[PDB]
Structure 1
Amino acid sequence: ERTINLYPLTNYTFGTKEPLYEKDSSVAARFQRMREEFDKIGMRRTVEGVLIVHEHRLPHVLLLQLGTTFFKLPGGELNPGEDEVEGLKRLMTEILGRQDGVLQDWVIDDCIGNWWRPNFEPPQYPYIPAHITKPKEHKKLFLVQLQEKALFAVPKNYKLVAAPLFELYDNAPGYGPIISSLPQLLSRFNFIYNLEH
């Protein structure tokens, strides 16, 4: 039985750093680069981290907001050959890593899901359909354990939000199939809701 410590949102201080922009400017260009890279390096390998806090003894998932309606987990595509866990730590530091001289280590241990994209299209599933032999993207989700107190730096374009589980639950129109299916996947863990002070 996996025992995870959760701490209140206020235990963490959220600073700011210079804006980070996506390699793609539109949805059509996103699938365009995917098509090009599939003929070069093959299947894309993506990783994302699930940072969990709590408020009022209920688990909250930290999401990066872009505008009013688009949410994402911190992560991104791996460079060819790169180890999944090391690549995530790199990708984490790039997005949420503190700006000063003190090190912020990432405790990334538990895999919580795998998602495959069968075509150069939006749909993803937690399995490969029986007629698919060459998936186009393979995503991987890891639980990131935050320590008692931590400093993060959020790029100016993004904003950081703590999404309660009930907000995500059964709310695919709100957050998408992956993020909205998080509560179910996260229920195996035994969370301790530590208080402030």
Structure 2
Amino acid sequence: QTKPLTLERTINLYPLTNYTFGTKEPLYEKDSSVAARFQRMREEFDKIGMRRTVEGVLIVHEHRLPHVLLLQLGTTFFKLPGGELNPGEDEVEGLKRLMTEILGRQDGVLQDWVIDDCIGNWWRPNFEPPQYPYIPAHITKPKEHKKLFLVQLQEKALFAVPKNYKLVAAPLFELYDNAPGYGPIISSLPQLLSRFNFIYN
């Protein structure tokens, strides 16, 4: 291409009709309560250090607009596929492992995840729910670093969703300025994806 890739990044999107969706056994969280969540985070912080989380943003197109694939628990709770990196693990290899754990097929046929773009970073300064897209100045030791990547999909694929979750294709306008519905990270994705030159195949 003529422009530097830093100035213009082009991404192939495929229509939602190119993809199929199944279900598999439920996948339960490592922590059974918020209290238990932050207790483990604290213990791992002392034993290992900062938690390293990676999440993937998977995009399809329908009706002229990019749609992000979200995991829904229940009515109101939404998350990106991803999770915790192991000590020393490469971020990209780690996200591919996690995507396979979460959405991989029971019949062993592998998805081909392509991950060439960081879209943002969120930092948890304390053992508490708030996260910011920067490290506050008084915090030299954040407790969690969450890194978001665009995951380029193959032209066609089957995604197997743990049956305790629903996979939804959310259009960008549903997310935009909707922190009450989706939280600050998901609701910022329209902004974070705006730089990409999407090709609607």
Which TM-score applies when normalising by structure 1? Answer: 0.96
Query: CA deviation digits over 1:120-178, x for unaligned, max 9?
Result: 11111111111111100000000001111111110111110001101100110110000
SS in 2 for 1:183: helix
Quick check: 2:68–2:170 contact (8 Å CA) kept in 1?
yes
The 2-side partners of 1:7 and 1:138 are apart by 30
Q: Kindly indicate whether residue 24 of structure 2 is the aligned counterpart of residue 17 of structure 1.
A: yes
- Contact in 1 for aligned 2:70/2:78 (Cα 8 Å): yes
Quote the offset at 1:10 in angstroms: 1.6
- Give the Cα separation in 2 of the matches to 1:170 and 1:103: 36
Is there any run of 5+ residues in structure 2 with no aligned partner, and where? 1-7
Q: How many Å apart are 1:104 and its aligned residue?
A: 1.5
Secondary structure of the corresponding residue to residue 95 of structure 2: helix
1:6 paired with 2:34, answer no
SS of corresponding position for 2:59: strand
Aligned to 2:111: 104
Q: Quote the offset at 1:99 in angstroms.
A: 2.0
Out of 58, 62, 67, the residue aligned to residue 65 of structure 2 is 58
Query: Following TM superposition, by how much is the alpha carbon of 1:113 offset from its aligned partner in structure 2, in angstroms?
Result: 0.4
- Higher deviation after alignment, 120-129 or 99-108: 99-108
The alpha-carbon deviation at position 17 of structure 1 amounts to 1.1
> How many residues align structurally?
194
User: How far 1:4 moved relative to its partner?
Assistant: 0.8
| TM-score when normalising by structure 2 | 0.94
Specify the SS of the correspondent of 1:23: coil
Residue equivalent to 2:153: 146
Q: Encode CA deviations 1:45-77: one digit per residue, 9 max, x unaligned.
A: 000000001111101000000011100000001
Residues 101 and 36 of structure 1: CA distance in aligned 2, closer, same or farther (over 3 Å): closer
8 Å contact 2:45–2:143 — kept in the other structure? yes
Q: Where do 5+ consecutive residues of structure 1 fail to align?
A: none
Offset of 1:192 from its aligned partner? Answer: 1.2
How far the C-alpha of 1:103 sits from its partner, in A, is 2.5
Q: Which moved more, 1:28-37 or 1:96-105?
A: 96-105
> Residues of 1 paired with 2:39 and 2:197: CA distance?
42
What's the counterpart of residue 141 of structure 2? 134
> Residue 112 of structure 2 contacts residue 154 of structure 2 at CA under 8 Å; is this kept in 1?
no
Partner residue of 1:181?
188
Give me the identity figure in percent. 100
2:110 and 2:163 mapped to 1: Cα distance?
Answer: 22
Query: Structure 1 residue 5: deviation in Å?
Result: 1.2
